[PDB]
């Protein structure tokens, strides 16, 4: 159940340290519909056969109601949801973990959160580890709501956090006193955008860069609260492009957990001190590929490809 | 339109830079629900009479309906019902003293999609009331992903502004404050100095050219607000400067003339603007917004608490 261990069993059961990213945007949804409606809803039908589609708890009465609209108020809700069910049913067998970015589930209103819950409900019935990338941040009082929403409502296994506002965040995010329970988190160390770090790098304390002070601070916080046992942990978000830095964290923080995005789209080099710099028992270095798989004409295949070339561990 | 202008008008209309915070949690809800229901729906019937409650777009048929989904005819709509009403309640009771209202997203998502429906209603309500608004969601992500937050915030909610955590990078602002396909501009407050205690390991103990991070980030915030011609368009990129950081405050105010500042932390985390807080960071007060939240929304007599802070801010403000 604990992350470390849930992530350990599944690693064996399938190897690979791939993390499929499920960030469906507005066009992913209209295309899946545009050419699903004009194909007799074959994929949605394939889904509807699944079975595990029954933990899902929001508008179950609409979700499992054979392909139809009227275009009813629930049209959009339908399809969006199914597009997600579709990807999962065809990619999970290659995934060690699924990572959903909250951001894409909120621009249309509550309808998108409903879907988020059904997705997390789904990934949860299959026993697939999850990551809600929302990189939360706020004051202890407030942060407590993100901890509830994330680990209590969605039953997620972990989530990303931005501790710039202060590292004590984690004590309210990774630990719930009222009921004990410990959770896992991923702190933002080095991100994947070009103007990336004139902060994570140009900034420093005694000439030790900011992403190191931050990386070090985050770890000393998981020492207190003793996550490591309890079967949880606090890891880092280190971009695929940040080759130099990746190799440094893996050396100074050798048994650490890493979540690295940026490959497949966002430009990338799977190999190269990425899956090498950061190597370890692979599940300690999750590679995330979203669009490269989710935007490809016929995925699973893409998945498989990544699985395979990721399975190329000459180590 | 234009945030600066919208902020400018209301100011002269009520003379005050008081930003009320509406961060409703569980106990505010159930207590509201029990009080009201104990003393037979005094405030709800009141809400049900307010003009703009008829313009809500989500489950309008439910919010308008003789006292509660009571539990006997729905139940499942109960929570939604009382939650939303507690908010209408606070806005109806304290809006006259507010220059701006600021809702923290964190309190609207813990219960799933039901809280978002309430949030949307709260924002539609203030919008009809035409009161400046701030969604404190302190967003941050790679651009083109951040656009989604931009849509949710300024398209769906039609909020005048949001708060932003620029740490991952400043270019993120290009996609939050500017649409660039509808040629639109938006306001924002980036986290500079926060009310956390250990709020300085990174914001202070970090430096670049003799400067502490919080200063450089404000500089990066601005240079970016210049690049996007948002200010020429009546929008802007301001700062979140906690109330318990007097020096940093005066510092910022001093070296950054005419900078919109958002400042939370009076009563709840200690402090009191009464003093240095609003003196430091003075100016034609919109520039300096004093967010007072839990001291009003959790107070037994909210219209009363809001007031107190009104005159208090009026006095010190001279
Ligand atoms: O998820 C993250 O923590 C993340 C950190 C970062 O620095 N850069 C970054 O792109 N990401 C994530 O990368 C995801 C997209 O993966 P792709 O679709 O393969 O680009 C987004 O949902 C972001 O949340
Ligand atoms: O950006 C903010 O909203 C914020 C930044 C900060 O550094 N400190 C801080 O307290 N806040 C906000 O202050 C609000 C609470 O106001 P109080 O109830 O008066 O403490 C919270 O909802 C926070 O979102």
**Top mutation candidate among B141, B168, B169, B175 for ligand 1, by most atoms within 8 Å of CB:** B141
The CA distance from B175 to B104, in Å, is 21
Look up the CATH number of the domain holding residue B5.
3.20.20.70
C-beta of A196 in contact with ligand 1 (< 6 A) = no
Resolution of this entry, Å: 2.7
Q: Look up tokens 């190191």; give the residue.
A: A212
Contact A199 B169 (CB under 8 A): yes
Q: What angle do CA A289, A295, A300 make, to 5 degrees?
A: 70
The minimum CA-CA distance between B137 and chain A, rounded to whole Å, is 9
Q: At what angle do helices A77-91 and A111-125 cross, to 10 degrees?
A: 30
Signed CA dihedral, B83, B270, B187, B178: sign only: negative
Token pair belonging to B108: 């609207």
C-beta of B163 in contact with ligand 2 (< 6 A) = yes
The DSSP code for A276 is: S
**Top mutation candidate among A18, A288, A294, A296 for ligand 1, by most atoms within 8 Å of CB:** A288
Q: Which residue of B has its CA nearest to A24?
A: B145
The CA distance from A31 to A81, in Å, is 13
In this structure, what are the phi and psi dihedrals at residue B4, rounded to the nearest 5 degrees? -50, -45
* A106 touches B116 (CB < 8 A): yes
Give the Å distance between the CA of B309 and the centre of ligand 1. Answer: 43
Chain A interface mutation, best of B80, B113, B179, B197, highest count of A Cβ atoms under 10 Å: B113
A110: region left, alpha or beta (phi > 0 left; psi from -120 to 50 alpha): alpha
The CA distance from A171 to B45, in Å, is 42
C-beta of B139 in contact with ligand 2 (< 6 A) = no
Chain A interface mutation, best of B58, B79, B112, highest count of A Cβ atoms under 10 Å: B112
Q: Look up tokens 């690049």; give the residue.
A: B227
- Cα–Cα distance list, B46 to B42, B55, B86, B286 (Å): 6, 16, 11, 31
* B7 touches B277 (CB < 8 A): no
Binding-site sequence positions of A for UMP: 23, 99, 101, 133, 135, 138, 142, 192, 266, 290-291
The number of folded domains in chain B is 1
Residue burial A177-194, b: 16+ Cβ < 10 Å; e: rest:
eeeeebbbbbbbbbbbbe
Contact A163 B202 (CB under 8 A): yes
C-beta of A264 in contact with ligand 1 (< 6 A) = yes
Of A286, A292, A293, A284, nearest to A310 by C-alpha is A286
Residue of B143, B167, B194 with shortest CB distance to A162: B167
Strand partners, A285: A258
- Cβ-based contacts of B23 with chain A (< 8 Å): 142
The CA distance from B66 to B64, in Å, is 7
**Active-site residue, selected from the candidate residues B120, B138, B193, B287:** B138
How many CB atoms are located within 10 Å of the residue A4 CB? 17
Method in brief: X-ray
Of A13, A9, A20, nearest to A286 by C-alpha is A20
The CA distance from A287 to A270, in Å, is 9
A28: containing domain: 1-315
3-state secondary structure of A159: strand
- Cβ-based contacts of B201 with chain A (< 8 Å): 166-167, 213, 217
Give the Å distance between the CA of A126 and the centre of ligand 2. Answer: 39
Q: Is B138 noted as a catalytic residue in this protein?
A: yes
Dihedral of CA atoms A188, B203, B18, B91 in degrees, nearest 10, equals 20
Give the Å distance between the CA of B193 and the centre of ligand 2. Answer: 12
How many CB atoms are located within 10 Å of the residue B111 CB? 21
Contact B148 A106 (CB under 8 A): yes
The minimum CA-CA distance between A136 and chain B, rounded to whole Å, is 8
Give the Å distance between the CA of B103 and the centre of ligand 2. Answer: 10
Contact B116 A139 (CB under 8 A): no
In Å, the largest CA–CA distance within chain B is: 66
3-state SS of chain B? CCHHHHHHHHHHHHCCCEEEECCCCHHHHHHHHHHHHHCCCHHHHHHCCCHHHHHCCCCHHHHCCCCCCCCCCCCCCHHHHHHHHHHHHHHHHHHHHCCEEEEEHHHCCCCCCHHHHHHHHHHHHHHHHCCCEEEEEEECCCCCCHHHHHHHHHHHCCCCEEEECCCCCCCHHHHHCECCCCCCECEEEEEEECCCCCCCCCCCCCECCCCEHHHHHHHHHHHHHHHCCCCCCCCCEEEEECCCCHHHHHHHHHHCCCCCEEEECCCCCCCCCCCHHHHCCCCCHHHEEEEECHHHHCCCCHHHHHHHHHHHHHHHCC
Query: Residues before each break in chain A (C–N > 2.5 Å)?
Result: 70
Cα B224 to the chain's mean position, in Å?
A: 22
Q: Tell the residue nearest (CA) to atom 5 of ligand 2.
A: B194
Residues contacting B92, CB < 8 A, separation 6+: B43, B46, B47, B50
Contact A106 B201 (CB under 8 A): no
Contact A25 B116 (CB under 8 A): no
**Top mutation candidate among A239, A261, A294, A310 for ligand 1, by most atoms within 8 Å of CB:** A261
Pairing of strands B133-139, B161-164: parallel
In this structure, what are the phi and psi dihedrals at residue B51, rounded to the nearest 5 degrees? -50, -55
Q: Look up tokens 């398209």; give the residue.
A: B155
Residues contacting B159, CB < 8 A, separation 6+: B123, B133, B134, B135, B153
Cα A81 to the chain's mean position, in Å?
A: 17
Q: Tell the residue nearest (CA) to atom 4 of ligand 2.
A: B264
Residues in chain A: 315
3-state SS of A171-229? HHHCEECCCEEECEEEEEEECCCCCCCCCCCCCEECCEEHHHHHHHHHHHHHHCCCCCH
């Amino acid at each position: 159940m604990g992350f470390k261990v849930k992530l350990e069993k599944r690693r064996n059961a399938i190897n690979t340290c791939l993390c499929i990213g499920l960030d469906p945007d507005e066009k992913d949804i209209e295309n899946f519909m545009k050419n699903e409606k004009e194909n007799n809803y074959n994929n949605i039908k394939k889904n509807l056969k699944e079975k595990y589609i029954n933990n899902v708890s929001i508008k179950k009465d609409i979700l499992l109601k054979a392909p139809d609209n009227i275009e009813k108020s629930e049209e959009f809700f339908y399809f969006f949801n199914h597009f997600c069910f579709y990807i999962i049913n065809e990619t999970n067998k290659y995934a060690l973990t699924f990572k959903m970015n909250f951001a894409f589930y909120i621009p249309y209103g509550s309808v998108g959160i409903d879907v988020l819950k059904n997705v997390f409900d789904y990934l949860y019935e299959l026993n697939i580890p999850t990551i809600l990338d929302m990189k939360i941040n706020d004051i202890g009082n407030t942060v407590k709501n993100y901890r509830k929403f994330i680990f209590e409502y969605l039953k997620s296994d972990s989530c990303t956090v931005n501790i710039y506002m202060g590292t004590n965040m984690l004590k309210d995010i990774c630990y719930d006193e009222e009921k004990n329970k410990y959770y896992s988190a991923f702190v933002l160390v080095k991100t994947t955008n070009p103007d990336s770090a004139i902060f994570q790098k140009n900034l420093s304390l005694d000439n030790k860069q900011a992403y190191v002070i931050m990386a070090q601070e985050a770890l000393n916080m998981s020492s207190y609260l003793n996550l490591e046992q309890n079967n949880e942990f606090i890891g880092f978000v280190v971009g695929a492009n940040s080759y130099d830095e990746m190799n440094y964290i893996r050396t100074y923080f050798p048994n650490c957990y890493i979540l690295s995005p940026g490959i497949g789209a966002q430009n990338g080099d799977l190999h190269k001190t990425l899956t090498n710099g950061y190597h370890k028992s692979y599940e300690k270095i999750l590679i995330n590929i979203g669009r490269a798989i989710t935007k490809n004409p016929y995925p699973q295949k893409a998945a498989q490809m990544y699985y395979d070339q990721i399975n190329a561990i000459l180590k």
